[PDB]
Structure formats: C-alpha cells, structure tokens
Structure 1
C-alpha cells in the first residue's frame, strides 16, 4: 500500500492504515548513529566516553568495501586513533563473516540497552585498563621524556573491542537462511523469558525505553488512558483463531524455511509481506525516481530524471551462512519508469517485493491409507518434475599450504599413489576444474606434505622394485569431498603467497572450493505451514495414482485430519478455504440480495478474478461469515462446472482404484514451506572410520563417518532385556578394544566366527588415572594374584 512497486493484493481489514510502520531495521541503525556521532544523528556517545576520563576524534573512510571484506576475510572497519563499522543491513563484518549484535535488556517495567550503548560500555573497560598502565608509565621514569605515544599502548582498547564482538553472548553470527530469519535476528532482545523479539510498531526511545504509538512512554502509561505482534508473527494469516503457543511455533518455522528456485508469493497472506521484504535488505530498491537504461542478469542501471546515474550489481548464487543460495532476479524491463523506494530486483525468498517463503499447493485433508499417518505427509511426484520445491544449496571447502616443521607443504597434481582417472578432473595446479561433477571421496585440491624418515616395510619395497614405482619422499594430504556429498563446482578462490596475499604467518597458499547442488524435494525432508504444523514427507506418490478432482486435476499433497481434534490449530483450515477462493475467483450474487454477511464488507471486493492474492491482517482480517458467502460464489473451471461446494469439500477419485472416495473431502490451497534441515544432511552411517586419540572411541571428523553414541540409558535397556553379549559387544569390540575391533574386521572378511572381546581401553586408562592419584589398584587374579595389562 502506498508503494510504487507494490502489486495488487486486496485487504479485508475494517480499519484504516496502521501507522508510519517504522523502518524495522532502524533500531540497529539509530543506536550506531548515536554511538558514532553521525551527522544525521546533543553530545555523541563516542564523544561522551572520553569526556568522563578527560583529563587525567575522527575516523577515516572505510578501508575496504563490504563485498571486499567478505571475500578477503577481513573486518569492515574505519581506523579511529581500526574501528568496526555497521552496514546498511545493520550488520558487522568481522574477519569476513557477517555478524549481528543483539540488544540486551537490563531492566531498571524494564529498559533495554541498544547496540550503541553496548559497544560504548565495552570501550570504558579498555580506557580504564589502558589508563591504569598510563599511571604506571608516567610514574616510572625520569620526566620530560614522556610523550603521549610512549605513555599509551592502545592494545587494551583494540583488544576489548575485538574481544567483545567475538566470545560475547550479545554478538552472534547473523542467522540467514531467508531474509526473514536475518531480519528477526536483528530486533531480537536478550536478558542475562530470557529471549524475545521486538514489537512491530515498537520504537525504542533515545535511552532505550520502548515507545508504543503519538508514541507513549512506558511510565506515561499510568498518567493517561496489532502492536503486540512481531514481524514473523504478523505474517500468519488467521492468527487470532490459532492458539498463542501455536503462533510462536509457527513464527519460528517461518525463519526456518529455505529459498526455493522459483520463490512464488503466498496466495493468502497479510499486509506485512511487502514492507517486511524490502526492509530485510536482501531486495534491490531504486534510490531515486527515474527510468532504467539497460538490464542484464549481472547489473541494472536506471537513468534518473535528475540526470544522475546509479547502478546495482546483483548477488548471483552467493552462499549464505547456512549454505542457502542468495540469488537475485531482475523484475523490471527496458524503457520502464520507476519511483523512489520501488523494487527493482527480487531477493532469494521474495516475488515482486513481498516475502515468498514457500509455495501454494492443492491440499486434501483425508487420511490416505496410513501413508500420512499421524504427522507424515504425502506429495505428488509433480513437485519433483516441476522443481516447485527444489532449492539450491552451496558448500564451501578450504585447504591451505604452509611451512612445516619438516619442510614446506606443496599442493600439486602429482599424487604419490593414484590412477590417472581420479586426477582426470584436476587442472595443472591440482585443484578441481570449474564446472566439474564431484562424488563422495573425489579430489578437490591436490596437496602434499613432507614425510620422513619413511622406513617402509620390506613387503612394501619389494613391490616397489618389482613394479619400479619409486617410493616418494612426501605423504598425501589432499582435500576430498566429504562422505555423502555431491554437486558441481561453482567457483574457486586461490590465495598465493608468491605474488601478493597477506596470508597468516606460515601459510604459503590458500584455495577455497565452492560446491552447490539442486536439491529436489525428497521423502524424509520436513515441510510446515505458518501455523506450527510440521511433518516429514512420508511418501511421494506418482501424479497418476493420486486423489484428483473431477477435472482430472491431481492434488499435490494429502494432509491427515488427526492433528485437528482439540489441538486447536483452527486457522490452518481457514487459509485452506480462502486459498481455494483466491485461486478460483468469485462473484457475489449481489444484485437485489446484497447479502447481510457482506454488509460490513468494502466495495468492489465483491468481484475478483482467478488467482488473485488476498491479505487478512492478523487481528482484523476476513471474518467468518464472509468466508462462507465467498464459497457460494466460486466460478467454474474451464468448462462451466463447480469443483468445491460451500463446505470447501469435493468428491475425489482415488487415482489407484478409480472409484470415487465415498465422502466429500475438504480440498483447498495452503501455503507451506520447505524447512531448513533435510534428509541428505541428516542421514549418517558408519562401519569403520577414524578413532579418537586420547580415548580410542570412534569419532567422525573430516569425511563425516561419525559413530552413533550408545549412552547409559541405552545400556539400561540392553541390561533390561538380558542381552549380555549384545551389550558387551557394543562397549568393547565396537568402541574401545584397540585389538578387538581390528580382529572382528579380519574375522568378518574371512567369514570366521567373531573373536572374543578384550579390555576396553577406557577401563585400562581408568587404572592409570587412579594410579596417577596415588591409589594402588591391583587386579588380583584368582591364581596369579597380580597382573599388568600390557
């Protein structure tokens, strides 16, 4: 509303415009403007700290750009006499990683300390600690040799600031798998009940007292007599009908979604989607009114009427913090007029300027033969063929060459023992070539380190002489793709000491590999709606054998009814009917009737075409009576005929038997999301792998191969069954027996019986620990009376 690029989404809300709807990111910016004493932002916070200790002020332009810092792994900072700065998204770059500083609430009704005051208080510790040395410095000498520099080492100042952004509970890595998650990470409040997010229209006051819209002071509430909703919560349509606990649970799952390749916008939403998307910052907004000049996937440029010229480089397939793709798309064309604050390009999870965290799917609410049993879900194979729920994921891999105790690490194509087929995908330097396909265990970068003395086994050398392969003097340390990962190689970042490249002391070269993969929606993944309902994809049925409407129109997913009984989640059923209304279109029968239910309604909402979008703001949206009338006017599909009655039900035909389902089933369109954690990442398996050093218990480091951990509670159950051998096997020859585990592996391959377990290394170490404590533990055999484990 009142935005040039805004699309056309009709609103039911019976009340007028809410308010200014203040810039959601301002809270993080205003505190920084004060702390830095920006001209736009009266004594500045930066100027105030020095006044206290004075006596016992400028920053130079930023060193490198935000894009440059995230690439070079440095910190976005401006020297002060390097002071970290804040970007347009209210974030910091510390050593190449995008970070956010949460705002603490530190009461004394309660008051919160915004980021500015937070960074200020950390400054004081460095000043007092730095001034403590000044006194010792200015006292320890003859005098008149003292200068300000010699008297002051600024180490405590810089250390406190660098030590604050890191290893601090307030400063956190920016959670970004979708623009909403990053937006709500900012504006989140913290206490030393402990965690909560800020109100939508909430506007903190200069000190940090929450002001609610004119704005009212906290103490001012006593003097004189939608604001309670957060950003994530204000996007749940039909929020009033769902339980409060379900709402919060539904909000958490919205910031848990992943960006889809197509990013379709919600069909039944609320007014917040537009303002929420552009404020997040992951969308491109025209700065000044004008017109575009040329549009390419790489950049968009607009020729302003003013005569100036601005351009925008589009993030393309940039990896997020959690591996999500950050692709931007251009929505405008050539010869198109634009306005200030209008959307130019779509972000990851946005379409035409509003948050598109999921897709709209046809839903049937029948229990379909136990395949949707109790929380699980069944989907049409269409969602795979049509890439509707497909999402791209990007993984980063790293390996470096540095100086060693023995020699110098060297990465090259030459590997001690390999076939030319594994190297078939490596270039000269030994790093995988761009655009290559990599399976589990393949080589990404070829590296080698010195080794010696070798002292090779005689049986090893005899083959060396027979086949004439000289035993090389160096050992293979080459980067291989982890177990269970696969994809294409997007790009490589090589940093070499030879030319330029400030790589830390010892490092001589660095190369990073970026791998990305299209992830088709797979059985096992997690989906969820905005109301807190979530479940695993239990099965995916071929589009053919799917319950389909009389059109022959197969339904996408089938949701079970059992969650509903006294678990209220009532809203989820409402957006399902409103979803079918929005998809099919309607034309109320108001010629002489003007039905009583539409009396409160606004004009011209009476008629809407097919596929229209709808917005029902949370605490005043579409009301119940109106929804019923809309199902009465539900225009036909291509050849005039009705698919959904006034009950939101239809006779579905079982696509596997052919006979219709005896009862009318509720069908509609619901907005669901693909959740963050996927099967591919969660499945693990191991037969043999790495073993810890101190304790021989198995551990999974690189190339995951991690071992499942058999706790005491599991041991309790094993004891309860009476399975003495299964328990002993798990605790001795599968975990700790340094000699047993290898013997059982040898036994399996030979096919011979499994050997007899030995002594768990854990227990052996136990005796030494007791002995180290001056306790003389004695094994006390029945016959020899004294045994050394050996």
Structure 2
C-alpha cells in the first residue's frame, strides 16, 4: 500500500551507526586488527605500557597478539562457553647485573570478544556492558557551602587512579589542603617542590589579601628536602621518616604516573581550564633529583584570583555535560584489565626476589591467573554487565545505548540526590529527557540521544549545521557541551527559502536559554528534532501532543513488546522504523547486487554479480534471553533480482523491514459497561480468531546426573512405581520425545538417585512385607514440569561425559536439557499498550456479535475508555486514531515525523477523502441514510458537532472529519446515543502475561534457619505477609487471622503439621504454639551472651524448648 510522508525538514545527515558506542569503543581498545608496530597507546596496549617494565632483574614488554576464538559465536551459546580469544604477550627478561636475555611469548588467558551487534557471550548468555556516566577528571572550583565568599577548589583524577584534594582557604588567612581527609597548610607542600618565598609574590603578587597570608616562615626556614620529611610525619603518624621512604610515599601519590592518572580527558580539561600545557597526566614530576611542580601553582593561581573577584574565574557546574563524561565499554574493561595486569606484577617481582635469580624465563615468572580472574570478574559480576535485553530487537538496541550513573566508580544509590538526576540544560540533544525509568533509578539510568556520539575523550557531542550570513551550510559539526555554549543556535524547524533563513524572528538558544533573534545573529541550526530524544522516543508518532510523563511510558514500554507471529509495523510511523530493523542487525540484507538462487524456511542462497554464491542460513526459532522466540522468516522468492542493501528475511517484530512491535487494530473509544474501568481493556474475540496478538515462548528445563557418595544418579526410562501411561512419551533413555505435548505433572526426564540412611525404616519395611515387592533401592527424582507451565517439546540436548567434545563440572556424569514451546494466544489478563502510555490489562473478550460496529457491518477490535485521556494528557493517541481512520479506508500507511509531522488540516483532508469511500460506496449500492443515523445526528446537533439544516451526508461528512462515526451496539442494534471516535491504532502486546504470574501454594518448601516458607513463584513460594500487612490485620482486630498468619501458616512447625492433618481429617485447626523463628531469636541472643527468659505470671521460667536444651 501507499506510504504518504509529511514533514518539511530536509535532514542533512542521517542517524549515525546506532551501536557504534558499543563496537567502536571495544575495538579502539583491542586493536586486534592493527599490526602491533602500528598500534597506539590507548586501551589494551596502554595498560601493558603502564605496568611494564617490572623492576628489581627486569622484565619488559614487547607486544601482544590476539588469536581467533576456539569456537564460533553460536557454539559458545550452546555449550555455555565464552566467546573469547586467546591473549599472548611477548616478553624479554634481562638481568639487572649481567645482560641476561630470554624471550618467550607467554599465554595470558582468554579475552572475550564482542559480536557484530554490540553484545557479548559469557558462559553462553548474551550480555551488554552499559556505559557509565561519572564526573570527569580535571580541576574544579565550587563555592563553599559555609563561607559565602570563600570557594573550595578540588582536584580529581580518573577513578581509583589517585586521590581527591581540596584547597579550602581556611578562616585563618593561609590556604589548606585535604588528602585522605588529612588537612594541613598548603605552604608546607609548595616548599617540597623547591619553591621560594619570593617566587610566590613573584607569581601571586596581586592579592595581598591572602597572597601575603599564604606565607608563614615556620616553614620557609627549611630547604626543599627538609619539609619533604616534615610532612611525611603529617600523613604517617608512626612510620620512620627516612628520606628513602618519604620520597616514595609522596611520589607514589602525586608524581608517579602509575597510581596517579588524570584522564587523558583530565589533562585537556585542566589544561584549557588553567590555560597551561601539561607534560603528562600527573600532578608532579620527579626530574633531576627533586620534584618539579606542574599543577599545584596554576590551581592555586585560579583559586586566589577568584576569591577576590578577578574576571574569567567562574565556578564550575559539575552537572554540565562538559564536566561529566562517559566511561564507554572499552574504557570500562581496560580499567579492569589495568587491575589484572598490576596484580600479575605483584606476582613476578615476588618470584624475582625469591627462588633462583638466574635460571628464570618469562614463561615461568608469569602466573596468568590474576589477569584471567579480573576479566572473568568484570563480565560476570559487574553492576555494568547486565543480562542482555533481547525481548524484541528494539530492546537489545536500546540496551546497548543505556547510561548508568551507578556502578563501580560512580554513585551508590544513597549517594544519588537531585542534581545527578535532573535534566540538565546541556542534555539537549545528547541524553534523552524522556527515556529513563520510573522508580528509584529515575535520572540515573538514561539513554543516548539519537544523533549524539561520544568523542575520543568520553564526552557526548551532538550535530549542528553552520549558518553563514543567513544561509545554512550543508557542513555539519558535532560540539561538546562546552563549545555549544559559545554560539546562538537556531531551531530545527526555523523556516527557509532554499537554504536561507526566511524569517525575521528566528527561534534560537544561547547557552540553553531561549532567545528571539534576527537571522544576522545566527551561527548554527539544529540538525533535526529527532536529535533531542532517545531512539525509542523517536518511535512515538505525534510526540508533540503527548505530556512528558506518558511519553516516557510509551517509550520504555516498547522494549517490552513481545514479538507477535503476525506482527505489523504501525500504520502511523515516525521514519525510524526502518533503520532500527537495520542496526538491530536482526533482519537480513543484501551484501552486493545479484540474483536469488534458492529460498527456503531454513536458508537463502544468492548468486552475486561477483559470481560468489553466498548462503545466508536462517536463524529459525531461536530462544532469546527472555524466552521470546527470536525467529527469522524469508522475504524473497527464487530468481528475485536484488539491488544492494535490499532485504532477504524479516527478523522478529519486523515486517518487510519495519519495526513491527505490535498490531494495528480497529479501536473504538467509549466506556463499555464496566470492562473499561480504570484502564482495563475490552477486546473482540475476532482477534484470537485471526491469530492477532499471538506469540511463541520457550523455557529451558535443565537437569544433571552426578556421581554421589551413595551411587550415581541415572537418566533412565525406569522410574519406580510409575505407570506406562505416565511414560508414554519418553524414549528408551528417559527423554520426552521431540514433539510431545507436556503439561503440569508430566515427566520430562526420568532420573534415579539412591536413598539414604533412612533406607526403609520399620514402618515401611513392613508395608512392603505385605505387598510382595521389597524395598527398592533407587528413587524417582524425575524432572517433572512446574505448575502452570508446558507445551510442545521442540528439541532436546543430552551431554554426557565419555562422549566427544564434552566435559562438565566435576562429579557430574550427564546433563540433559529439554526445550519446550507454547503458542500464546492473547488471554484475559495480559497487558496491552500503545506508544503513548495508554497501558491496560485485557479484562474481557466479547464475541463479535457484542462488539460495537459500524453501519456497514464491521465490528471494532478494541474498546478503549475515554477516561484514560483527560487526566493522562497524552493526546497523540487521539490523533493517531484519526489519521488511522483515513488510512483504513484509503488503504494507506503514513510517516509523520516527530515535531515535524502531519498537522490537523492535512489530516482532516485525508478524512474527507475516506468519507467518500465509506459512504459513497453506499448511496450507490442501493441504500440511503439509515433511521438510527438520524436519531444520532439529531443528538450531534444538540451537541454542536454538526451544522443544522444540512443533508445527512453533509453532516456525517462533518462528524467524520471530527474523526467520529455512528456506532451500533451489537447487543441491541440500537445506535450509540452519540457519535464515537473510531480509528486505527498501533497497540503492542507487552511481556507481562497472566500465564507467567499466576501462582498459589497451599504448603511447600521452607527455609533452613527460620522454617518460614520460601519465596518466589519458582521455588513454589509463600506470599510475604509484611509488617504493613500485619498492621492491616491489627487495625481490623483479626487477632485469630493474624496469629494464624504468624504460626500455622508460616513456621509453627508443630501446629503447622497439626493443621494440615486437621483439614484432610475434616477437623478445625488446632490452637497454635510458639513460632519456631522466635526460638531462633532466643538462641541467637544466647550466642551474644544474653539470657532471654519466658516467664509465667508468678515469675518462674517456662521452657519453650520442652526440656530439649536442659540437662
């Protein structure tokens, strides 16, 4: 069908490659594609260069190499391996005394590799490394919260690469300094740098205010290396101040570019800040015997001139996006790498001075393990290594572009206040202002703007067109926050003739404040409106008619779009629906021009013009992280002639290459008898019929059989006491047959473990004595299916040991996995949502004979309730229906660009053109106006929707253009007293389905120390009845109902057992005894030497342990 566009904004550049922040980053840290000679001292390299060479014997670093992975991407996904490359590093040992030369290339472990789309595989599950936001290295000044006229200065390096330092000028005239929270007069330190009384006034010499106060010659009466020892006493209360130990402590804190690194960023920021070039990323130097300061006096220069009033000395806004910055994934891991390397260096020098100082190689002086472990750590338990979000393909892409303020190096939740979370001015077009989570993480976790990129220093920059005179150049440049603030910048949509600014008032920002300014004064212009919002946010049509607090829900809620087996792109799109399917790298495209050779549910082979015969195989029915079938379907036919970059298969939730998050449905917006109540939703049974909102889901069910101190566990088809009917789907070995139907209770894999020292006790040895079978020695431990689960066995994997290629964790014989599937029709309880924040649960499925319907027999699919819209303030979904009405009868889809879309006239135009089809079809097919359509028109006139005294066609026309139609209740035939809004909406099925959340337990597992029930659906939980629930019962005064909760229903082991016996015996439950968890409270106070004591009214103890702990 036709795809009508709107939008006047000729966007100059396109969206940049949407995973570059994940991929570009790691590669600029590995360099596994650069000839070592040609490498450059960033990333994996720079870490080697830093830790090496090791010192007294000496061991120096030549070069590293990386080998290809021992198993291909998919092989690791299956075998729960990691997709990693072997890391070799060539070294040369050389003897500090003779001239020794040995040179091995010792193996360091495996560095894990990043796939094409930006993900990782770590023990066979995809994961994402969320870039982290943090205050950036550099030197800042910010007023003192106490003394309104004195200002702390602060000096901050990269995380854990040096200490913080403040220069608060005290109330006693002379300037202080804090290191490890240890304050002392700054002067003492300047001395140690070889500084002289005069060359201070020779450099300060203006502010006799304090320049003359900074000086106090109880210090000046000392040479440089004299105060050197003076201060080692000030920070080491106890250590012998030897002139070998003090030069080592200071240096190891302030001039040692090995545990003091300002950022590569930190250099430039402090450079331009204090306007001085900076040799290296380090506060001080050791050069020609003594210390030569680099950063302390410049900083001391700024601070003083500020506390008087000098120009060009502004406090700094640490929440500006020039003073914050992003630790991308590559940087984040070389950090962890630079910590494994340094640990290995504690392990060489240790064996460099004990064990034999001449019969030594690199090979046996290096224990690879301290490195191997810090890498295994970063990827398997960082806050920033998260299980991938591959619900649908948007979820994986949105993930890779996440930004956490939290994590190792940043903010502890408690450390997070307001300024961190606020939307800052400088977010504009770098971090989305919508896309962030509701809840406690609001404003810490955010999303990368769509046009935005991170420069080599870790700052986010956004594009802008350069205007000269008043004409707009096609030359685009990306600015950091800081330089942006220098210009007057016109708005995305300031109107143009050709490429000249055609207005006389132009809408522009100067340092983020809005200013009205003439086209003479205009230096740059936004590239687009798409540049201010997330990717997801740019998927919201009619965004400018949507209050922000629901734009946000429609933004996040998309990444929860279950992929539907008949998915379709939204009738009203925003223009990104295509790139997203692209960069998501989930659909499957054409590498060069060619013709198509074969085509099949399983593979797509294409002859190219190069004669090459590529064979793209199809990822068909692959189980995602979240259980959602990640299914690749083919979109070409034999011999199809394909130009480059055309499509060859749709990924999941993609239709002919467009992001198909849900379905387009005929929606009526009208209360419906209570099933609309509070966002609930009513749906037409005609939806399950045509398999709309259906989805396929999978769960892995895994089991091990392990060697035991009582025998081996056995995967058998031979389970004691089990009827063949109860096995009629298991193969010889004990596996369900691929293609069975399995439901709750069903065995999926039979298994036998040996019984214990409770091998049949008397009670039991006798019961068998009567039945002619003696006690059996093995046990049914079969893997059944959980309550409320099941489906159709689609595969099985059986890994023993003793088979090739395979070796499992120690003591385990064999491990069997059975993947089960289900086709999930929509059902009453599942969650639906639209891109505007309308979210609700399916509360009712009427049969089509009850659905409101149009005169011409057609029933609606969804009855939303108008009470959602007013207080919610998200009007877009209103327009999205109206333009959906038109589209429905013209047979068109539309592309309405965000903030530059189709406006009300353009669209009421399209409704007229539809009316013609819907009604003119009629008054010719032999039918006129209908008797009920008048009774409604009568009402519409009292309302004011229609002009009185006009032909019904004239009026129905008029209602239509208001997007309203006549609707007959299917329960009566009588019309809805009013004219209703009916149109076409994009509505996704969310991931939260009743099937995954119904749960109930009578009695189940309990906890070791508390004997209170376990928690969680998967453990077969109990429901936590908390302090607040207890209050509830308390306020009611339901003493017996509460007590029940606190004894027989939780951990009153005696009366608990006693009760369940009472029910199955048809008796009332018995009055309870003391909860077991209280006993634990007694015993735990004894272990602290406190003698707690239950007592009767006459003050004599009472044994709540029934004598079992008295002698």
3-state DSSP of counterpart to 2:661? coil
3-state DSSP of counterpart to 1:544? helix
Shift of 1:64: 0.8
In the alignment, structure 1 residue 546 sits paired with structure 2 residue 574: no
Match of residue 121, structure 2, among 88, 93, 110: 93
After TM superposition, the structure 1 stretch with the greater mean CA deviation from structure 2, 338-347 or 490-499, is 338-347
2:52 match: 54
**How far apart are the structure 2 equivalents of 1:539 and 1:246?**
25
**How far apart are the structure 2 equivalents of 1:451 and 1:742?**
24
Match of residue 546, structure 2, among 242, 264, 271: 242
**How far apart are the structure 1 equivalents of 2:759 and 2:383?**
51
**How far apart are the structure 2 equivalents of 1:487 and 1:261?**
17
In the alignment, structure 1 residue 210 sits paired with structure 2 residue 210: no
Matched ranges for 1:285-684 at <5 A: 285-500=589-804, 501-585=806-890, 610=891, 612-634=892-914, 635-637=916-918, 640-641=921-922, 645-684=960-999
**How far apart are the structure 2 equivalents of 1:364 and 1:507?**
59
1:596 match: none
Shift of 1:74: 0.4
Structure 1 pair 120–705 and aligned structure 2 pair: CA distance change class (3 A): closer
Preserved CA contact (<8 Å) 2:622 2:629 = yes
Preserved CA contact (<8 Å) 1:199 1:228 = yes
1:76 match: 83
Shift of 1:712: 1.2
1:690-727, Cα deviation, whole Å (9 max, x unpaired): 22221111125786532111111111111111111111
1:552-581, Cα deviation, whole Å (9 max, x unpaired): 100001011112224310111000001111
2:386 match: 172
**How far apart are the structure 2 equivalents of 1:729 and 1:402?**
41
2:332 match: 118
3-state DSSP of counterpart to 1:535? strand
**How far apart are the structure 2 equivalents of 1:380 and 1:200?**
38
2:171 match: none
1:64 match: 71
**How far apart are the structure 1 equivalents of 2:353 and 2:555?**
60
3-state DSSP of counterpart to 1:86? coil
1:270 match: 574
Shift of 1:18: 4.4
After TM superposition, the structure 1 stretch with the greater mean CA deviation from structure 2, 552-561 or 19-28, is 19-28
3-state DSSP of counterpart to 1:360? strand
Shift of 1:142: 3.5
**How far apart are the structure 1 equivalents of 2:131 and 2:641?**
40
Structure 1 pair 454–417 and aligned structure 2 pair: CA distance change class (3 A): farther
2:1071 match: 756
Preserved CA contact (<8 Å) 2:326 2:458 = yes
Match of residue 187, structure 1, among 401, 413, 417: 401
Preserved CA contact (<8 Å) 2:966 2:979 = yes
2:429 match: none
3-state DSSP of counterpart to 2:132? strand
**How far apart are the structure 2 equivalents of 1:753 and 1:205?**
73
**How far apart are the structure 2 equivalents of 1:546 and 1:702?**
36
Preserved CA contact (<8 Å) 2:795 2:818 = yes
Matched ranges for 1:682-721 at <5 A: 682-699=997-1014, 704-721=1019-1036
Preserved CA contact (<8 Å) 1:365 1:561 = yes
**How far apart are the structure 2 equivalents of 1:537 and 1:499?**
50
3-state DSSP of counterpart to 1:217? strand
Structure 1 pair 639–512 and aligned structure 2 pair: CA distance change class (3 A): farther
Structure 1 pair 568–472 and aligned structure 2 pair: CA distance change class (3 A): same
Preserved CA contact (<8 Å) 2:550 2:872 = no
Preserved CA contact (<8 Å) 1:78 1:85 = yes
After TM superposition, the structure 1 stretch with the greater mean CA deviation from structure 2, 165-174 or 742-751, is 742-751
**How far apart are the structure 1 equivalents of 2:356 and 2:734?**
62
**How far apart are the structure 2 equivalents of 1:339 and 1:47?**
42
3-state DSSP of counterpart to 1:580? helix
Shift of 1:639: 7.1
Number of residues of Structure 1 aligned to a counterpart in Structure 2: 759
**How far apart are the structure 2 equivalents of 1:471 and 1:498?**
32
Match of residue 102, structure 1, among 130, 144, 147: 130
* Structure 2, unpaired ranges of 5+: 55-63, 89-109, 137-321, 411-442, 464-475, 489-528, 923-952, 1107-1111
Moved over 4 A (4+): 40-44, 700-704
After TM superposition, the structure 1 stretch with the greater mean CA deviation from structure 2, 397-406 or 702-711, is 702-711
Shift of 1:664: 0.6
2:1058 match: 743
After TM superposition, the structure 1 stretch with the greater mean CA deviation from structure 2, 42-51 or 423-432, is 42-51
1:115-140, Cα deviation, whole Å (9 max, x unpaired): 11111111111111111221111011
Preserved CA contact (<8 Å) 1:61 1:78 = yes
Preserved CA contact (<8 Å) 1:689 1:700 = no
1:290-339, Cα deviation, whole Å (9 max, x unpaired): 11100011110110011112111111111111110111110011111113
**How far apart are the structure 1 equivalents of 2:1035 and 2:15?**
61
3-state DSSP of counterpart to 2:886? helix
In the alignment, structure 1 residue 221 sits paired with structure 2 residue 484: yes
**How far apart are the structure 2 equivalents of 1:238 and 1:496?**
57
Preserved CA contact (<8 Å) 2:719 2:752 = yes
In the alignment, structure 1 residue 254 sits paired with structure 2 residue 558: yes
1:40-62, Cα deviation, whole Å (9 max, x unpaired): 89545322222223323211112
TM (norm. structure 1) is 0.93
**How far apart are the structure 1 equivalents of 2:335 and 2:557?**
35
Match of residue 450, structure 2, among 183, 186, 200: 200
**How far apart are the structure 1 equivalents of 2:759 and 2:801?**
33
**Higher relative contact order, chain-length normalized (CA < 8 Å, sep 6+):** 1
Match of residue 31, structure 1, among 8, 16, 25: 25
* Structure 1, unpaired ranges of 5+: 1-6, 586-609
Preserved CA contact (<8 Å) 1:454 1:473 = no
After TM superposition, the structure 1 stretch with the greater mean CA deviation from structure 2, 522-531 or 406-415, is 406-415
TM (norm. structure 2) is 0.67
**How far apart are the structure 2 equivalents of 1:18 and 1:692?**
63
Structure 1 pair 251–545 and aligned structure 2 pair: CA distance change class (3 A): same
Shift of 1:459: 4.1
1:412-453, Cα deviation, whole Å (9 max, x unpaired): 111122222111221111111111111112111111112233
**How far apart are the structure 1 equivalents of 2:83 and 2:573?**
38
Preserved CA contact (<8 Å) 2:570 2:664 = yes
2:201 match: none
Shift of 1:196: 0.8
After TM superposition, the structure 1 stretch with the greater mean CA deviation from structure 2, 485-494 or 243-252, is 243-252
2:278 match: none
**How far apart are the structure 1 equivalents of 2:865 and 2:370?**
61
1:93-135, Cα deviation, whole Å (9 max, x unpaired): 1110111111112232222121111111111111111112211
